Design an enzyme around this catalytic site. Sequence first.
Site, PDB file in Angstrom:
ATOM      1  CG  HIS B  41      -0.582   0.212   2.518  1.00  0.00           C
ATOM      2  ND1 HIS B  41      -0.200   1.459   2.991  1.00  0.00           N
ATOM      3  CD2 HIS B  41      -0.530  -0.671   3.542  1.00  0.00           C
ATOM      4  CE1 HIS B  41       0.114   1.282   4.264  1.00  0.00           C
ATOM      5  NE2 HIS B  41      -0.063   0.015   4.640  1.00  0.00           N
ATOM      6  N   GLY B 143       2.425   6.135  10.244  1.00  0.00           N
ATOM      7  CA  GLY B 143       3.837   5.954   9.925  1.00  0.00           C
ATOM      8  C   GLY B 143       4.444   4.675  10.475  1.00  0.00           C
ATOM      9  CB  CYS B 145       2.415   1.088   7.550  1.00  0.00           C
ATOM     10  SG  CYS B 145       0.745   1.641   8.015  1.00  0.00           S
TER      11      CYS B 145
HETATM   12  O1  QYN Z   1      -4.592   2.461   9.021  1.00  0.00           O
HETATM   13  C1  QYN Z   1      -3.536   2.670   8.435  1.00  0.00           C
HETATM   14  N1  QYN Z   1      -2.330   2.630   9.040  1.00  0.00           N
HETATM   15  C2  QYN Z   1      -1.961   2.810  10.391  1.00  0.00           C
HETATM   16  C3  QYN Z   1      -1.180   1.861  11.048  1.00  0.00           C
HETATM   17  N2  QYN Z   1      -1.092   1.709  12.375  1.00  0.00           N
HETATM   18  C4  QYN Z   1      -1.768   2.556  13.132  1.00  0.00           C
HETATM   19  C5  QYN Z   1      -2.540   3.627  12.630  1.00  0.00           C
HETATM   20  C6  QYN Z   1      -3.084   4.636  13.464  1.00  0.00           C
HETATM   21  C7  QYN Z   1      -3.672   5.742  12.923  1.00  0.00           C
HETATM   22  C8  QYN Z   1      -3.761   5.894  11.548  1.00  0.00           C
HETATM   23  C9  QYN Z   1      -3.272   4.935  10.708  1.00  0.00           C
HETATM   24  C10 QYN Z   1      -2.645   3.765  11.215  1.00  0.00           C
HETATM   25  C11 QYN Z   1      -3.497   3.167   6.989  1.00  0.00           C
HETATM   26  C12 QYN Z   1      -4.013   4.606   6.916  1.00  0.00           C
HETATM   27  N3  QYN Z   1      -5.420   4.912   6.587  1.00  0.00           N
HETATM   28  S1  QYN Z   1      -6.057   6.302   7.177  1.00  0.00           S
HETATM   29  O2  QYN Z   1      -5.837   6.326   8.590  1.00  0.00           O
HETATM   30  O3  QYN Z   1      -7.381   6.457   6.657  1.00  0.00           O
HETATM   31  C13 QYN Z   1      -5.115   7.468   6.372  1.00  0.00           C
HETATM   32  N4  QYN Z   1      -5.556   8.052   5.276  1.00  0.00           N
HETATM   33  C14 QYN Z   1      -4.544   8.894   4.878  1.00  0.00           C
HETATM   34  C15 QYN Z   1      -3.504   8.808   5.745  1.00  0.00           C
HETATM   35  N5  QYN Z   1      -3.881   7.902   6.692  1.00  0.00           N
HETATM   36  C16 QYN Z   1      -6.321   3.760   6.439  1.00  0.00           C
HETATM   37  C17 QYN Z   1      -5.625   2.600   5.761  1.00  0.00           C
HETATM   38  C18 QYN Z   1      -6.330   1.801   4.861  1.00  0.00           C
HETATM   39  C19 QYN Z   1      -5.768   0.653   4.331  1.00  0.00           C
HETATM   40  C20 QYN Z   1      -4.493   0.303   4.706  1.00  0.00           C
HETATM   41 CL1  QYN Z   1      -3.862  -1.250   4.229  1.00  0.00          CL
HETATM   42  C21 QYN Z   1      -3.742   1.102   5.545  1.00  0.00           C
HETATM   43  C22 QYN Z   1      -4.306   2.258   6.085  1.00  0.00           C
END
Ligand code: QYN
Lengths: 302, 305
Positions: B41, B143, B145
């Site tokens: 991703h 961040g 990930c």
């Molecule tokens: O959740 C994910 N990673 C994270 C990882 N660990 C703890 C997190 C804590 C808080 C925010 C993210 C976290 C990401 C990010 N986003 S999100 O939040 O909507 C986003 N939209 C733009 C920037 N961030 C959904 C998403 C969807 C699919 C996939 Cl595979 C990854 C992910």
Amino acid sequence: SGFRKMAFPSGKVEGCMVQVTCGTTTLNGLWLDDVVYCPRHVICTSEDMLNPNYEDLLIRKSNHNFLVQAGNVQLRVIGHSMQNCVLKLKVDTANPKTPKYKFVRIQPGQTFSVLACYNGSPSGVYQCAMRPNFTIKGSFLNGSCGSVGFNIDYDCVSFCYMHHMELPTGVHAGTDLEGNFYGPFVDRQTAQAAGTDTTITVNVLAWLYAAVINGDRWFLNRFTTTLNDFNLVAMKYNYEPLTQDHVDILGPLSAQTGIAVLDMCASLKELLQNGMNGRTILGSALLEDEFTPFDVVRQCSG
Amino acid sequence: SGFRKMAFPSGKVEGCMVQVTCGTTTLNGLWLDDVVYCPRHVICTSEDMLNPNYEDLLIRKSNHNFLVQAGNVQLRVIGHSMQNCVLKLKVDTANPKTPKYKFVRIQPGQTFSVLACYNGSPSGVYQCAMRPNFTIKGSFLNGSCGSVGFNIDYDCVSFCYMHHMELPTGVHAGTDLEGNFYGPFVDRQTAQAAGTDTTITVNVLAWLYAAVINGDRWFLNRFTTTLNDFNLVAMKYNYEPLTQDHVDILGPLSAQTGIAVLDMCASLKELLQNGMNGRTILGSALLEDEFTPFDVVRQCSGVTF
Ligand SMILES: O=C(Nc1cncc2ccccc12)[C@@H]1CN(S(=O)(=O)c2ncc[nH]2)Cc2ccc(Cl)cc21
Ligand SMILES: O=C(Nc1cncc2ccccc12)[C@@H]1CN(S(=O)(=O)c2ncc[nH]2)Cc2ccc(Cl)cc21
Ligand SMILES: [Cl-]
């Protein structure tokens, strides 16, 4: 999201762990530049445990009596000196893996990571706090002496603890890296007992602010308290007094969540009165006191 | 004495953490030999993350679109390929700090250490379990990930997890190092929820044995139970079924303490029906399920790495 008990990455400390042998005793040492630090009780013969005279036992030693092993390599001891309860063994090789470091003495309530070692080999890392009674509730077995406590804020390792002994209650006592014990303890097998332990109030409050930051608000109430009224209640639950310094320290968390310190103090007073009633706060059924205000800001906000 | 939630020393894994940047997305990568592994991703955009065709997105990217940073040194990407939900970036330099390693897929109930990173820099290490619902109750922010989960066996690092996302309940989802998700999750912005979670029974029993080893005996009783009667009780409290394999696994702990596994099960049954009554076990008012039988033996014996 999430709130875990988190330790610092141990890599910078693993590259410093060595084994120190003197006679029949083997324990851990910390190799920084050309010096190996270790508990001075490595020179004791168990019969020199009730009343050791370390100056008398050390004057009888020569450099070749101390066997230092770094991995599968023997280090040569070229000098030795005692500083309080730590033995400083001068070696002929400077550790190439020596990180940027400092020796810091911490206050009760402070947290740190422990790299538990046996025979100079790291076996685990865990998060700890210096209890108000100066003990640490660690996870240590025989041969863990010389294992160290540390914090790694930025790229600098601040060494704050060296393990020396286990007390009869299963808790642990040790020194800072300058050899000064935390608490009223001595490196002697004499009748020593940890004083009555108390809950670190400022840490519980910080952990309640972390719960609010993570969306848990069930324990909040419409009340406030004076600092004096809170301390009169807190003392009755074996909680440490909360000082104006603690209130000042909680300021950033109060500003971020919009909950005054004295209002959060009123929520804690109520939690101590009611219990949790089958509920949990951040996955815990007890009030957690091993996260400082600094740990909460670091883990919840980056 | 003492019983702490303990993680493996993270040093062998710290030497593998790198930062991977593609467009506006920055996350962590695992540099082993001449390959950097990271969540696929990292190639996603605003509308791409909604419904992504990852082959169509990867074709558009060239090697120089992936910026890999190992400390203060930029690594040059000389190839790229996808394996399930992981992106494999071929680099020109083999990691000189590559430890002896394996890629292993774990089962629910098994534990591992997680080295949480932000911008290719390790910030913390914590121990956790793969829940029966395939999520992990981790501690992660934006961040994180690409942060990895691992176990250490002698001098070999077994990589078992790579973080990909956070679910709406605050729990986390990820894959093994071959890109296969743990659980019924997909790597995209859509309606996903963790299933109802259960307690890892064999782990609670192992933790009760650790409490006995540390001198906590109040919960012990004179009774024993049948495996069938215990499982009928356990199913009622959302506890995972206990198998004959679990009983066999707890054997060494049963022999060391003198408490037969079905004798300890009767203690667990009484605890589930009556509670703790104001008492604690190993400083906890809840039944802990994130220590496996091997974690208990390892910690209550001092195994080193
Ligand atoms: O959740 C994910 N990673 C994270 C990882 N660990 C703890 C997190 C804590 C808080 C925010 C993210 C976290 C990401 C990010 N986003 S999100 O939040 O909507 C986003 N939209 C733009 C920037 N961030 C959904 C998403 C969807 C699919 C996939 Cl595979 C990854 C992910
Ligand atoms: O207690 C110590 N270290 C440990 C360290 N950590 C956790 C331990 C767990 C379990 C056993 C030891 C542990 C040592 C050794 N012990 S001892 O085991 O009672 C012993 N008596 C004779 C030979 N060995 C007395 C002692 C007295 C003073 C000082 Cl400074 C150190 C120590
Ligand atoms: Cl301090």
